[PDB]
Amino acid sequence: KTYTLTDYLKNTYRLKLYSLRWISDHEYLYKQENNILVFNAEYGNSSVFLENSTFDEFGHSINDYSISPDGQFILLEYNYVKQWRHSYTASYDIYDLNKRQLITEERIPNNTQWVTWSPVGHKLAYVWNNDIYVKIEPNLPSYRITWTGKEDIIYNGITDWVYEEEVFSAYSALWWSPNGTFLAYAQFNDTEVPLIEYSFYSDESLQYPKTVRVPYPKAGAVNPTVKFFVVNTDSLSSVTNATSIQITAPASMLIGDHYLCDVTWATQERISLQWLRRIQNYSVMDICDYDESSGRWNCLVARQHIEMSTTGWVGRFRPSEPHFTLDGNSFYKIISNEEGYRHICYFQIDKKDCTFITKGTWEVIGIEALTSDYLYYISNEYKGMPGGRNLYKIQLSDYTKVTCLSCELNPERCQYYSVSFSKEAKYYQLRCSGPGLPLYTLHSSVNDKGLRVLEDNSALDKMLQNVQMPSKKLDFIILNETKFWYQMILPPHFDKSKKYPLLLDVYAGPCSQKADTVFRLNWATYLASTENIIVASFDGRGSGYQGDKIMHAINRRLGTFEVEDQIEAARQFSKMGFVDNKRIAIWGWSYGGYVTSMVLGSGSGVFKCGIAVAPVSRWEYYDSVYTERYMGLPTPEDNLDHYRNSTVMSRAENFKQVEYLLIHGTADDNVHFQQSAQISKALVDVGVDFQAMWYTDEDHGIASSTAHQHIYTHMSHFIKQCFS
Amino acid sequence: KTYTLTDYLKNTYRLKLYSLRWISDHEYLYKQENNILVFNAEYGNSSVFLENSTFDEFGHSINDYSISPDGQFILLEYNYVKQWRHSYTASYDIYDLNKRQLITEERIPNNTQWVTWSPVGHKLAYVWNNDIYVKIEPNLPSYRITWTGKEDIIYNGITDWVYEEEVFSAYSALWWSPNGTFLAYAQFNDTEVPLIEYSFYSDESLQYPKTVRVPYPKAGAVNPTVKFFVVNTDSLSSVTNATSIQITAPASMLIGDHYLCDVTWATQERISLQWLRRIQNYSVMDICDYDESSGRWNCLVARQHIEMSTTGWVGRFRPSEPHFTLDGNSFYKIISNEEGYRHICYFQIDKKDCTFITKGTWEVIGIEALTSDYLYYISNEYKGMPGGRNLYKIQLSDYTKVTCLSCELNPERCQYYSVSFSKEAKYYQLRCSGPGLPLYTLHSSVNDKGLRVLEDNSALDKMLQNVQMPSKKLDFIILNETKFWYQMILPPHFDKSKKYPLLLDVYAGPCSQKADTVFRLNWATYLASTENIIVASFDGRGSGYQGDKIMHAINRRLGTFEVEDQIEAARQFSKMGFVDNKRIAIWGWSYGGYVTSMVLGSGSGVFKCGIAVAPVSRWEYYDSVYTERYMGLPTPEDNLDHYRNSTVMSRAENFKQVEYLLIHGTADDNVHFQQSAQISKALVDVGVDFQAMWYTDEDHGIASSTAHQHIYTHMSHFIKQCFS
Numbered sequence A, B: 001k002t003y004t005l006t007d008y009l010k011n012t013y014r015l016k017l018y019s020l021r022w023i024s025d026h027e028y029l030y031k032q033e034n035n036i037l038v039f040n041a042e043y044g045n046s047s048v049f050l051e052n053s054t055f056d057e058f059g060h061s062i063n064d065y066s067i068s069p070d071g072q073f074i075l076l077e078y079n080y081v082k083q084w085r086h087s088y089t090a091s092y093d094i095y096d097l098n099k100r101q102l103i104t105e106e107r108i109p110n111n112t113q114w115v116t117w118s119p120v121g122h123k124l125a126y127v128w129n130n131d132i133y134v135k136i137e138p139n140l141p142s143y144r145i146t147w148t149g150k151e152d153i154i155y156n157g158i159t160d161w162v163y164e165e166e167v168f169s170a171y172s173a174l175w176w177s178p179n180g181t182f183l184a185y186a187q188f189n190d191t192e193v194p195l196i197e198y199s200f201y202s203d204e205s206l207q208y209p210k211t212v213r214v215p216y217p218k219a220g221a222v223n224p225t226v227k228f229f230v231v232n233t234d235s236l237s238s239v240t241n242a243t244s245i246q247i248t249a250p251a252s253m254l255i256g257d258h259y260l261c262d263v264t265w266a267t268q269e270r271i272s273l274q275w276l277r278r279i280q281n282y283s284v285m286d287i288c289d290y291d292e293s294s295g296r297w298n299c300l301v302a303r304q305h306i307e308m309s310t311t312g313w314v315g316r317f318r319p320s321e322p323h324f325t326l327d328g329n330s331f332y333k334i335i336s337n338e339e340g341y342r343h344i345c346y347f348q349i350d351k352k353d354c355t356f357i358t359k360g361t362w363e364v365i366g367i368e369a370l371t372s373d374y375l376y377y378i379s380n381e382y383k384g385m386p387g388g389r390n391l392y393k394i395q396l397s398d399y400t401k402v403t404c405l406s407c408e409l410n411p412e413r414c415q416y417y418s419v420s421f422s423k424e425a426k427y428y429q430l431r432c433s434g435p436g437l438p439l440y441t442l443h444s445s446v447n448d449k450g451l452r453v454l455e456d457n458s459a460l461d462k463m464l465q466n467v468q469m470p471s472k473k474l475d476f477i478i479l480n481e482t483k484f485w486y487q488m489i490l491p492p493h494f495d496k497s498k499k500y501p502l503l504l505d506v507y508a509g510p511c512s513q514k515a516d517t518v519f520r521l522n523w524a525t526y527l528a529s530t531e532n533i534i535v536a537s538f539d540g541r542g543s544g545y546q547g548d549k550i551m552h553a554i555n556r557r558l559g560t561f562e563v564e565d566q567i568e569a570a571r572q573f574s575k576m577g578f579v580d581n582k583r584i585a586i587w588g589w590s591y592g593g594y595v596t597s598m599v600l601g602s603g604s605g606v607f608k609c610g611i612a613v614a615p616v617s618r619w620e621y622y623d624s625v626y627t628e629r630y631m632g633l634p635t636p637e638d639n640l641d642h643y644r645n646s647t648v649m650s651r652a653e654n655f656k657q658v659e660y661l662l663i664h665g666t667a668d669d670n671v672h673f674q675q676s677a678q679i680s681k682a683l684v685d686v687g688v689d690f691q692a693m694w695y696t697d698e699d700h701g702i703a704s705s706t707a708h709q710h711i712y713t714h715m716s717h718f719i720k721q722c723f724s
């Protein structure tokens, strides 16, 4: 028995998850069969919190649910309908937990864009027709905070396309204060932002294709504009258009185009904002306090902190979020050090200078939790391995007092940890993601004792002893004075004296990491397990978590180094023994599809065939926030030269050497079908034959059940034939 | 040496044409190297009419030219830009032939939609921004006849999309009177006609794809509306909004949706109109005279003629044009007889009845010319062969006096004749199109003597003796009580004892003819000549020129019989000895790609693989005027059942048996990319793998140089591999 295509497509061998939501410092919620329980971390006793059959007679399939922090109500999400990556619209109902009743009066309206409880109690903020509405009690009418909401144009409390995708990574553009006093929120004006237009074909029943219009700023176009507002939730008369206090931006930002690039409450009346210049090498953090007499908000110029880089852009993808101390007069934040690595800096609100509380030739991944005693963070420090993630705690009173809480718990099975903390960090869950099978455990902060095994994946482990699994080799090579890391999926019973066909798996994007220690069951699995193909990945220049030395290498020169290094990576895998060098392939999605595409066009004659899924083909076509962060503006004064020098269309000729499969979803809002339509065009003009495949009404995911299957099947056939 | 792909793609062996424009009863114009001459048919003397170098210093490449009937001016078309099938826009200049001067005053403006001389003299009618303009003299200002012209909405003197394509087959919707007194013209209101919208990608330079919007009535939608107008060209004050006399329609037509479906001047003041009901089984011809006292036009109810069919629709694609006698009180017209064949009927203006002046089991193709002595017509009567076209003359005073003027002139080389007549029919050109090489000859009507050989294609004939050409077998088979014709391109040295792979070439549309006697040098040529593949065609039910018995068979049941008969055809070619029955393919464009598609989806297991280019996939998606002419309205009262039963989507499942290559131009206005996007979708839902290929910014012709090459190359590889 082997790991076949269908094993992968039909999810034959499921990985197990343990999904819990902390509701207190010592309690969380689990979902079981169809039941919601609640486990106690201190005792281990659990009690049915809601019973599976409670909504057999609801009449609607329940997509998701939310429980008000004070446990008084449960929010029922249904009639879900996806939009973009994180955005969607739904109907909502509120069920009363104290009683046993579905609230009928003053319900949350159909087509609601976003919804959220206050961090405390059961206040509701909800965006609907682009406008904000508040409900202090589930059964009472709602206070319409905004009136300016207009479709495709004004966004109140929700992001527009570009902010959703490239900045915040959610639909929601609002933010409760810790006790739920204030509702901070952002506003987006798409007024002069140009529309991307594309057909949507719908059911065969639909006689005329719908044209879809989306405010989308391509590289160097008119951006959306943003204002920020804070509202008081308490002072709300049922006969008063409620008063929203606009916090304006710093004037160092108001000189040109800017983006609001972070929002973090510090205390009950202190809120921190972070602003980014359109040229994204210079950032600023305001700290804004409440003038109780005025009702205004005051951002002291003395409390501002500047973040900037000389070597490139600011942040990994944006400037990091801050982690404030209970009182809120000092904060911790991840920044590049002088050597260019990403470590934690301790800041005093009024002191421009900070002090680095971690150091080394590694990078802090993220600050996970902060107490009066400790700061919890993830880094790749253990064994100088960047593919690995571990939980550490550092003594706030003694910065030389660092203990790894996860390194030693299972060195062979576990090297990729994520963490979930209880309120105020009494307990933590550790999720291990590889290189062995996923391992989920509970832990108490107090003494760092391993309470229990929540999931071991024994169930799966049993099935996998029956199946001929491939192995995963993670190593490095040395190119210049640097080690660059790579990973390989080796077919089961890998004989290093034979010659194998190799498929270079490509992403290669600024701050990518395709070489890590995670356990995966994907298509690559199948390709090694069954077709005895080596699927390799490699993190060349531009990849992240290895200091700005490597990451910023790609700066202002996209589609150059990261592309060259992937070709180089092939060369070196051939210098090892096991690679048939007349059957080397390359594939990629999105950025990786672009890189896959630049490679096939490089003339390097290293690769027989490649597949490009939803590739970017020319940077000018991609959105501004992402493109410019890397390439600045496409104008002869700024960077137009490297824009025009980095296209796939320019390399159209060299595809005469290779066999190319090009695949794009026609309803892709993210990388537009445009990009592939320009590619297919170029090739045709210079007479290169190739393979194409469009996916009707698919997006950037090609993620619908049928399509996902179809595309992956189709690509197999292609690689099979290409390799014979 | 063989006929390779490149031979075809790079036009290696050119067929020769002889293109002449009659300017008188005895003189025509020829174009040579770069010169315009004029030949005299009577003497044979020719004189340079315009010299090649006359416009070396013009500064613009001249796309086309027109010479005023009175030889006084030449119209120079340049900055040509194609729109749809017949429509385009251009700049114009007028060069004075009497003098030697390019007119500078009051020029014809850039972006002109259409332009035409009066049949006599040198009046100009020209449509520009949808409005009509007249110039009686090239140098004087122009009288703006219409003011109602609005883009995409009101069409003055030009057709909109659906009329252009499906009705008239030109851009122009105006009509001079014989001496150039009147300018009859049509008007089109697209006001509630729905828009087809589709992207256009342009040069890679273009950052946001252009959306293209076109008033296109899909089957059963809101149609454009039409009004008709006649103007007097003489009474034109340079300070008078000129008066256009609206001729309204008959009231048997005004009860519902109608189309103007023909316009033919009878005399200097008698004009004939033909109106068609939206349900296209009932037509009417008005005959409208000029009330000199009134300045109005009068369509006597006593002069109306009704044309209708019980077995289906009226006409081959529309009701025929009439041919009036010099005085204009009687006309000749081609209609179905009682047996259902298309012959000539002699009509008196006031008598409802006509008399058939031809009869038999064959069809009159068209009335070519009419004198006071004779009527010239083309028919397929010779040898009971429908694939063949011949020129006959019938004695107007004696209907039993018919002589074929072309049958016997070269029986072996020539069976497909077209004709070009001089003014009042003193001389005629015969174009022979096959089965041998094209042969162009000059003839005098008077005695029917063959004056000279204008082109013999000897030049080509020489090259083709060096090359291994395939042969062409035209035969029939008997299916029911009927003979259905087929044709076959046999590889060179065709050994009927061997087993050959066969490609069924498919069109199959209502009134199609793929089986004829014409000499072609296309892709099929290469496929037989080089890949020893038999390329067959077959004219099953629904095909034309074989009476309404066969043509109307397909009525109201599209995607049924014509599809079935093609499968049948295969069966029969296998019952002959020469066909490998494990390597039978099928291909088709437009209608033929739909039929290719319905077949591969029929489950008949006869065909290994097929290619569908720009196929219709569901009839509701195609335009009204074509679809309904065959299928009526798509409503449960009328025909919705056969609409829904005839889709390619419905046969998605069976494609599992075959290998399918689906090809569509993204910028196709005619058969929308929609149609293939619905097809590719269906297949993906039921899990059928297939092959796809889109062509960025190509139209329904995929006719751009590069693309034409690319597609035909791509299709070769597919057939090659499919046949091994």
Ligand SMILES: N[C@@H](CNS(=O)(=O)NCc1ccc(S(N)(=O)=O)cc1)Cc1cc(F)c(F)cc1F
Pocket (backbone or CB within 6 Å): A165, A166, A169, A317, A509, A590, A591, A615, A616, A622, A626, A670, A671
């Ligand atoms: N839209 C871009 C950003 N996608 S993303 O929202 O997913 N940002 C990357 C990212 C990865 C990981 C994390 S983290 N470490 O917080 O989980 C944040 C952001 C990715 C992208 C790049 C392309 F080149 C492209 F063609 C399309 C595309 F979506």
